[PDB]
Amino acid sequence: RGLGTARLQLVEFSAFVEPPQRHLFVHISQPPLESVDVRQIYDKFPEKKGGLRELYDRGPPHAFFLVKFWADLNWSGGFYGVSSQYESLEHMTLTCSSKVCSFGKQVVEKVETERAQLEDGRFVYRLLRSPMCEYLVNFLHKLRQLPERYMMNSVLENFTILQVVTNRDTQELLLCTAYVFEVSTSERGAQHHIYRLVRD
């Protein structure tokens, strides 16, 4: 079990800031996964069209994952970027939609397209150094100034991301990942915990 199906697998995901080498706010580099019932987090995502509940209803359910991040927020200019890499055995073009939610309502949607590239006997899909939406750069700047880690976590309870990767040519849903967030201490460092989303 990783974040992936037989059809597409997440290889690496990071959100970072670079000076004008890198600070990683969160990072995934890729036993069986534990499960989280989607009803547990229904009250953290839009009940609106295209949200988590509507998508999970249409399935397929094994495409759905939850990532809990403990972000490192201890690092004024600079490049804010997000990098993601997927791999598959079949040649596809991917549409990747990233939806930022604050208090349930969607405040950002970012849609990118990536064509397969053959590498080492498989297909890779590289969306590297995508600039972070301005909403998030400003939010990180404000969040960083909070005096106490528990105040950051309070604020972050209301903040979620939903990423939806689809086969662009077929419109088939390949992967749907819900992200929730807390802040880590500088001593522990960034951490994550991937879960299968279930409902049965």
UniProtKB/Swiss-Prot annotation:
It is found in: Nucleus. Residues 1-200 are annotated as: Transcriptional activation. Interacts with YAP1 and WWTR1/TAZ. Transcription factor which plays a key role in the Hippo signaling pathway, a pathway involved in organ size control and tumor suppression by restricting proliferation and promoting apoptosis. The core of this pathway is composed of a kinase cascade wherein MST1/MST2, in complex with its regulatory protein SAV1, phosphorylates and activates LATS1/2 in complex with its regulatory protein MOB1, which in turn phosphorylates and inactivates YAP1 oncoprotein and WWTR1/TAZ. This is Transcriptional enhancer factor TEF-4. It comes from Homo sapiens (Human). The chain holds residues 221 to 447 of 447 of the full protein.
